[PDB]
Every structure is written in structure tokens, then in C-alpha cells.
DNA sequence: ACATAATC
DNA sequence: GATTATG
DNA sequence: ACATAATC
DNA sequence: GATTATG
């Protein structure tokens, strides 16, 4: 029942991610893949980040 | 708003997957990773497959 | 503890 | 995305 | 069309 | 996992 360990993002990765979010809250597959590449993340990690970021935004 | 294209599984991959499901409907991260490796899939694709397989099982 | 990553 | 669970 | 992969 | 959407 073990789950994946919480990922820690580098300041640098967060930059790229926050940069993308500023442009769009719902990046398409193309955008998520290129961002994953740039950030040295998996597309899965990127998708999860965006879901969680949207949550934070609305929580405001 | 483009989404990832539907993945097609080889008969061989399905074998491994169905084999795993038979053992457990909720494989842990360890199991999903090793299965991804064996099957030449991403762990993301494996996780999604298991969710969808559970749905089929209950639909019965 | 809680902010937020992972699950489903 | 609502819920669960952890670095 | 629908079975089932992807989204969120 | 409920919902959305496609090979």
C-alpha cells in the first residue's frame, strides 16, 4: 500500500512550473511534455503539480 | 487542450498487467515500478491501467 | 502541523 | 479535483 | 459505437 | 474513481 515518496522540487524547477502556470492553468500534453523535458521531470510529475497548483490558486 | 493519445497495449503487456491484477487490484509503488520496467511502460501508464481495470471488474 | 505531493 | 497522507 | 485510455 | 473523450 506504499505510495510514491513526496517529490521535492528545486527552486529552478518551481520557476519553470510557475512560469507555465502563469501562461495557462491547464497546459496540453504538448506543453506538459516540453516542460517535463526542460525541468528534468516526468510528464506525470508535471501533471500532478498543475492539479495541486490549481487547488492552491482557488484556495486563495 | 490536447490530451495524450490513447495508448495501445501489446498482447504481451496485457499479459503482465492482467497477471499483476490477479495478484492485487491495488499494487504499491514498488510493484507498479517493477511492472512498468518489465512491460516497457511508464509507471504512469501502469497506474492508469489499474484504475481502468478496477472499473471493468466492478462493472461486471 | 500544515502545505502540498500522491492517489484514484 | 476531492480526498489522503507525508516531508 | 463502445470499450477503455486519459483527465482531474 | 467519476467523468470525458477516442482509437
UniProtKB/Swiss-Prot annotation, chains A, B:
It is found in: Nucleus. Residues 2-60 bind DNA. Changing residue 53 to C: In WS1 and WS3. It is linked to Waardenburg syndrome 1: WS1 is an autosomal dominant disorder characterized by non-progressive sensorineural deafness, pigmentary disturbances such as frontal white blaze of hair, heterochromia of irides, white eyelashes, leukoderma, and wide bridge of nose owing to lateral displacement of the inner canthus of each eye (dystopia canthorum). WS1 shows variable clinical expression and some affected individuals do not manifest hearing impairment or iris pigmentation disturbances. Dystopia canthorum is the most consistent sign and is found in 98% of the patients. Can bind to DNA as a homodimer or a heterodimer with PAX7. Interacts with PAXBP1; the interaction links PAX3 to a WDR5-containing histone methyltransferase complex. Interacts with DAXX. Interacts with TBX18. Interacts with SOX10. Transcription factor that may regulate cell proliferation, migration and apoptosis. Involved in neural development and myogenesis. Transcriptional activator of MITF, acting synergistically with SOX10. Belongs to the paired homeobox family. This is Paired box protein Pax-3. It comes from Homo sapiens. The lineage of its organism: Eukaryota, Metazoa, Chordata, Craniata, Vertebrata. The gene is PAX3. The chain holds residues 219 to 277 of 479 of the full protein.
Amino acid at each position: 500500500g506504499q505510495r510514491r515518496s513526496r517529490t521535492t522540487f528545486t527552486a529552478e524547477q518551481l520557476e519553470e512550473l510557475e512560469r507555465a502556470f502563469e501562461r495557462t492553468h491547464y497546459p496540453d500534453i504538448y506543453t506538459r511534455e516540453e516542460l517535463a523535458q526542460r525541468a528534468k521531470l516526468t510528464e506525470a510529475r508535471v501533471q500532478v503539480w498543475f492539479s495541486n497548483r490549481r487547488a492552491r490558486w482557488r484556495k486563495q
